[PDB]
Ligand binder design. Structure first.
Ligand SMILES: Nc1ncnc2c1ncn2[C@@H]1O[C@H](COP(=O)(O)OP(=O)(O)OP(=O)(O)O)[C@@H](O)[C@H]1O
Ligand SMILES: [Mg+2]
Length: 264
Protein backbone atom coordinates (compact mmCIF):
# COMPACT_ATOMS: atom_id res chain seq x y z
CA UNK A 1 0.00 0.00 0.00
CA UNK A 2 1.16 3.58 -0.58
CA UNK A 3 1.05 6.40 1.96
CA UNK A 4 0.17 10.06 1.49
CA UNK A 5 0.22 13.02 3.83
CA UNK A 6 -1.04 16.41 2.69
CA UNK A 7 -0.39 19.44 4.86
CA UNK A 8 -0.50 17.54 8.14
CA UNK A 9 -0.20 19.08 11.59
CA UNK A 10 -0.44 17.26 14.91
CA UNK A 11 -0.60 18.84 18.34
CA UNK A 12 0.37 17.47 21.70
CA UNK A 13 -2.40 15.60 23.42
CA UNK A 14 -2.49 14.18 26.89
CA UNK A 15 -0.93 10.77 27.34
CA UNK A 16 1.00 10.93 24.06
CA UNK A 17 4.04 12.02 26.02
CA UNK A 18 3.81 9.03 28.35
CA UNK A 19 3.58 6.70 25.37
CA UNK A 20 6.54 8.46 23.71
CA UNK A 21 8.79 7.50 26.62
CA UNK A 22 7.85 3.83 26.41
CA UNK A 23 6.60 19.28 30.67
CA UNK A 24 4.11 17.45 28.42
CA UNK A 25 1.27 19.16 30.26
CA UNK A 26 2.62 22.54 29.18
CA UNK A 27 3.05 21.50 25.54
CA UNK A 28 -0.56 20.30 25.54
CA UNK A 29 -1.90 23.36 27.35
CA UNK A 30 -0.06 25.70 24.94
CA UNK A 31 -1.40 23.71 21.99
CA UNK A 32 2.14 23.24 20.72
CA UNK A 33 2.51 21.45 17.36
CA UNK A 34 4.52 18.24 17.56
CA UNK A 35 4.63 18.04 13.76
CA UNK A 36 3.75 20.95 11.46
CA UNK A 37 2.92 21.04 7.76
CA UNK A 38 4.17 17.57 6.88
CA UNK A 39 3.89 16.49 3.25
CA UNK A 40 4.90 13.23 1.64
CA UNK A 41 3.69 10.89 -1.09
CA UNK A 42 5.13 7.38 -0.91
CA UNK A 43 4.24 4.87 -3.66
CA UNK A 44 3.81 1.15 -3.01
CA UNK A 45 7.08 -0.69 -2.57
CA UNK A 46 9.02 2.53 -2.10
CA UNK A 47 11.37 3.20 0.79
CA UNK A 48 11.18 6.47 2.71
CA UNK A 49 14.22 7.56 4.70
CA UNK A 50 13.45 9.85 7.62
CA UNK A 51 16.24 11.68 9.40
CA UNK A 52 16.77 15.01 11.07
CA UNK A 53 18.04 16.64 14.25
CA UNK A 54 17.66 14.96 17.61
CA UNK A 55 14.12 15.19 18.99
CA UNK A 56 12.70 16.49 15.71
CA UNK A 57 9.55 14.36 15.64
CA UNK A 58 10.71 11.27 13.79
CA UNK A 59 9.14 8.79 16.16
CA UNK A 60 6.05 10.97 16.48
CA UNK A 61 5.44 10.97 12.72
CA UNK A 62 5.44 7.21 13.06
CA UNK A 63 2.92 7.23 15.92
CA UNK A 64 0.88 9.48 13.65
CA UNK A 65 0.66 6.64 11.14
CA UNK A 66 0.05 4.08 13.87
CA UNK A 67 -2.87 6.32 14.77
CA UNK A 68 -1.53 6.92 18.29
CA UNK A 69 -1.40 10.66 17.53
CA UNK A 70 -4.23 12.42 15.76
CA UNK A 71 -3.77 14.74 12.83
CA UNK A 72 -5.34 18.07 13.84
CA UNK A 73 -5.17 19.38 10.23
CA UNK A 74 -4.32 17.84 6.87
CA UNK A 75 -5.03 14.53 5.21
CA UNK A 76 -3.27 11.22 5.78
CA UNK A 77 -3.98 8.24 3.52
CA UNK A 78 -2.68 4.69 3.81
CA UNK A 79 -4.39 1.35 4.20
CA UNK A 80 -3.73 -2.15 5.35
CA UNK A 81 -1.83 -3.72 8.18
CA UNK A 82 1.21 -1.86 9.36
CA UNK A 83 4.15 -3.43 11.19
CA UNK A 84 6.10 -1.32 13.66
CA UNK A 85 9.67 -1.77 14.86
CA UNK A 86 10.25 0.66 17.73
CA UNK A 87 13.54 2.23 18.69
CA UNK A 88 13.32 0.21 21.92
CA UNK A 89 14.06 -3.39 21.09
CA UNK A 90 11.84 -5.51 23.28
CA UNK A 91 12.27 -9.23 23.97
CA UNK A 92 9.47 -11.30 25.50
CA UNK A 93 10.19 -14.52 27.44
CA UNK A 94 10.77 -17.46 25.12
CA UNK A 95 13.14 -18.67 22.44
CA UNK A 96 14.79 -16.58 19.74
CA UNK A 97 12.49 -18.29 17.21
CA UNK A 98 9.41 -17.76 19.37
CA UNK A 99 10.37 -14.08 19.65
CA UNK A 100 10.62 -13.62 15.87
CA UNK A 101 7.33 -15.28 15.19
CA UNK A 102 5.20 -14.32 18.22
CA UNK A 103 1.62 -14.41 17.15
CA UNK A 104 2.10 -15.17 13.49
CA UNK A 105 1.58 -18.37 11.51
CA UNK A 106 4.85 -20.28 11.04
CA UNK A 107 6.11 -20.64 7.46
CA UNK A 108 9.52 -22.28 7.35
CA UNK A 109 10.62 -20.52 4.16
CA UNK A 110 9.37 -17.15 5.28
CA UNK A 111 11.15 -17.59 8.65
CA UNK A 112 14.52 -18.75 7.41
CA UNK A 113 14.36 -16.02 4.80
CA UNK A 114 14.00 -13.30 7.45
CA UNK A 115 16.56 -14.77 9.87
CA UNK A 116 19.17 -14.95 7.09
CA UNK A 117 18.33 -11.43 5.81
CA UNK A 118 18.60 -9.90 9.31
CA UNK A 119 22.03 -11.46 9.76
CA UNK A 120 20.80 -13.56 12.70
CA UNK A 121 22.54 -16.69 11.41
CA UNK A 122 25.92 -15.30 12.56
CA UNK A 123 24.44 -14.95 16.06
CA UNK A 124 22.43 -18.15 16.71
CA UNK A 125 25.27 -20.24 15.35
CA UNK A 126 27.14 -19.17 18.51
CA UNK A 127 24.63 -20.89 20.80
CA UNK A 128 24.32 -24.57 21.64
CA UNK A 129 20.58 -24.55 20.89
CA UNK A 130 20.79 -21.98 18.07
CA UNK A 131 17.43 -20.22 17.58
CA UNK A 132 15.84 -22.48 20.25
CA UNK A 133 17.98 -20.75 22.83
CA UNK A 134 15.84 -19.41 25.67
CA UNK A 135 15.86 -15.68 26.41
CA UNK A 136 14.51 -13.85 29.42
CA UNK A 137 12.28 -10.76 29.38
CA UNK A 138 14.48 -7.99 27.93
CA UNK A 139 17.16 -10.35 26.53
CA UNK A 140 19.59 -8.70 28.92
CA UNK A 141 22.71 -10.75 28.21
CA UNK A 142 22.49 -10.20 24.45
CA UNK A 143 24.15 -7.24 22.75
CA UNK A 144 22.30 -4.12 21.68
CA UNK A 145 22.70 -5.12 18.04
CA UNK A 146 21.53 -8.70 18.63
CA UNK A 147 18.42 -7.40 20.39
CA UNK A 148 17.72 -4.98 17.57
CA UNK A 149 18.09 -7.63 14.85
CA UNK A 150 15.64 -9.98 16.60
CA UNK A 151 13.31 -7.05 17.25
CA UNK A 152 13.70 -6.11 13.56
CA UNK A 153 13.15 -9.71 12.41
CA UNK A 154 9.91 -9.78 14.37
CA UNK A 155 8.55 -6.70 12.65
CA UNK A 156 9.75 -7.83 9.23
CA UNK A 157 8.40 -11.39 9.60
CA UNK A 158 4.96 -9.96 10.19
CA UNK A 159 3.06 -9.71 6.93
CA UNK A 160 1.99 -6.12 6.44
CA UNK A 161 1.46 -3.54 3.75
CA UNK A 162 3.52 -0.82 5.42
CA UNK A 163 6.59 -1.26 7.63
CA UNK A 164 7.77 1.37 10.14
CA UNK A 165 11.35 0.75 11.21
CA UNK A 166 12.49 3.17 13.86
CA UNK A 167 16.25 3.50 14.13
CA UNK A 168 17.23 -0.18 14.14
CA UNK A 169 20.73 0.73 12.97
CA UNK A 170 22.43 2.56 15.83
CA UNK A 171 24.87 0.24 17.59
CA UNK A 172 28.60 -0.55 17.52
CA UNK A 173 28.57 -3.64 15.20
CA UNK A 174 28.44 -1.15 12.34
CA UNK A 175 29.52 -3.66 9.72
CA UNK A 176 26.74 -6.05 10.50
CA UNK A 177 24.34 -3.13 10.27
CA UNK A 178 25.52 -2.39 6.78
CA UNK A 179 24.88 -5.99 5.72
CA UNK A 180 21.46 -5.98 7.42
CA UNK A 181 20.39 -2.79 5.61
CA UNK A 182 21.44 -4.23 2.27
CA UNK A 183 20.08 -7.77 2.70
CA UNK A 184 16.92 -7.01 4.58
CA UNK A 185 15.75 -3.44 4.03
CA UNK A 186 17.02 -3.18 0.46
CA UNK A 187 16.67 -6.71 -0.92
CA UNK A 188 14.19 -8.96 0.91
CA UNK A 189 11.88 -5.92 1.46
CA UNK A 190 12.46 -4.31 -1.92
CA UNK A 191 8.76 -4.39 -2.86
CA UNK A 192 7.35 -3.55 0.59
CA UNK A 193 6.41 0.05 1.34
CA UNK A 194 8.72 1.00 4.14
CA UNK A 195 9.75 3.93 6.29
CA UNK A 196 13.17 3.90 7.92
CA UNK A 197 14.19 6.40 10.61
CA UNK A 198 17.95 6.74 10.18
CA UNK A 199 21.10 8.80 10.80
CA UNK A 200 23.24 7.14 8.10
CA UNK A 201 23.72 8.95 4.78
CA UNK A 202 23.96 5.72 2.78
CA UNK A 203 20.33 5.09 3.69
CA UNK A 204 19.32 8.47 2.32
CA UNK A 205 21.22 7.72 -0.90
CA UNK A 206 19.52 4.34 -1.45
CA UNK A 207 16.05 5.55 -0.51
CA UNK A 208 13.32 6.42 -2.97
CA UNK A 209 12.16 9.44 -0.99
CA UNK A 210 13.70 11.49 1.83
CA UNK A 211 12.29 13.49 4.71
CA UNK A 212 14.53 15.56 6.97
CA UNK A 213 12.88 16.95 10.09
CA UNK A 214 13.93 19.74 12.41
CA UNK A 215 11.89 21.10 15.32
CA UNK A 216 8.87 19.11 14.22
CA UNK A 217 9.06 20.82 10.86
CA UNK A 218 9.98 19.57 7.38
CA UNK A 219 13.49 20.80 6.57
CA UNK A 220 13.44 18.87 3.25
CA UNK A 221 11.35 16.41 1.24
CA UNK A 222 12.42 14.88 -2.04
CA UNK A 223 14.95 12.60 -3.69
CA UNK A 224 18.60 12.24 -2.72
CA UNK A 225 19.39 14.00 -5.99
CA UNK A 226 17.07 16.91 -5.23
CA UNK A 227 18.79 17.13 -1.82
CA UNK A 228 22.25 17.78 -3.28
CA UNK A 229 21.04 20.60 -5.50
CA UNK A 230 18.26 22.12 -3.35
CA UNK A 231 20.24 21.91 -0.07
CA UNK A 232 23.91 22.03 -1.14
CA UNK A 233 24.87 23.54 2.20
CA UNK A 234 23.50 20.59 4.14
CA UNK A 235 24.54 18.14 1.41
CA UNK A 236 28.12 19.38 1.20
CA UNK A 237 28.71 19.18 4.95
CA UNK A 238 27.42 15.66 5.47
CA UNK A 239 28.87 14.23 2.29
CA UNK A 240 32.13 15.95 3.22
CA UNK A 241 33.02 13.23 5.75
CA UNK A 242 34.79 10.13 4.57
CA UNK A 243 33.08 7.59 6.80
CA UNK A 244 30.21 9.41 8.49
CA UNK A 245 28.03 6.22 8.63
CA UNK A 246 30.61 4.53 10.87
CA UNK A 247 30.64 7.28 13.49
CA UNK A 248 28.61 6.30 16.56
CA UNK A 249 24.88 6.87 16.50
CA UNK A 250 25.33 9.80 18.92
CA UNK A 251 27.99 11.60 16.86
CA UNK A 252 25.99 11.22 13.63
CA UNK A 253 22.88 12.76 15.29
CA UNK A 254 25.05 15.47 16.81
CA UNK A 255 26.56 16.46 13.47
CA UNK A 256 23.06 16.24 11.92
CA UNK A 257 21.50 18.46 14.57
CA UNK A 258 24.23 21.11 14.40
CA UNK A 259 24.11 21.15 10.61
CA UNK A 260 20.33 21.59 10.77
CA UNK A 261 20.50 24.32 13.40
CA UNK A 262 23.03 26.13 11.18
CA UNK A 263 21.44 26.02 7.74
CA UNK A 264 18.02 27.33 8.93
N1 LIG B 1 11.68 11.15 26.88
C1 LIG B 1 11.21 12.36 26.58
N2 LIG B 1 11.15 13.30 27.56
C2 LIG B 1 10.69 14.52 27.25
N3 LIG B 1 10.26 14.99 26.08
C3 LIG B 1 10.32 14.04 25.12
C4 LIG B 1 10.77 12.74 25.28
N4 LIG B 1 10.70 12.06 24.08
C5 LIG B 1 10.22 12.95 23.23
N5 LIG B 1 9.97 14.17 23.81
C6 LIG B 1 9.41 15.39 23.18
O1 LIG B 1 8.73 15.05 21.99
C7 LIG B 1 9.28 15.81 20.87
C8 LIG B 1 9.37 14.88 19.68
O2 LIG B 1 10.07 13.69 20.05
P1 LIG B 1 10.14 12.43 19.09
O3 LIG B 1 10.48 11.25 19.92
O4 LIG B 1 8.93 12.42 18.22
O5 LIG B 1 11.43 12.87 18.27
P2 LIG B 1 12.57 12.06 17.50
O6 LIG B 1 13.09 12.99 16.47
O7 LIG B 1 12.16 10.68 17.14
O8 LIG B 1 13.62 11.94 18.69
P3 LIG B 1 15.05 11.24 18.79
O9 LIG B 1 15.94 11.96 17.82
O10 LIG B 1 15.41 11.25 20.23
O11 LIG B 1 14.84 9.77 18.63
C9 LIG B 1 10.62 16.33 21.37
O12 LIG B 1 10.95 17.55 20.71
C10 LIG B 1 10.36 16.54 22.85
O13 LIG B 1 9.70 17.77 23.10
MG1 LIG C 1 12.90 8.47 17.98
Amino acid sequence: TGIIMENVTAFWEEGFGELLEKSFSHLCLVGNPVLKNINLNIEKGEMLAITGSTGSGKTSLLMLILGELEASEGIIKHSGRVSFCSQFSWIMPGTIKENIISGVSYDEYRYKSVVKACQLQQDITKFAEQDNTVLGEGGVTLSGGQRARISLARAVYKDADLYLLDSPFGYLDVFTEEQVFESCVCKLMANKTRILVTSKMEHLRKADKILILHQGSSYFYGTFSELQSLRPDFSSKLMGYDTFDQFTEERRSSILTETLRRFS
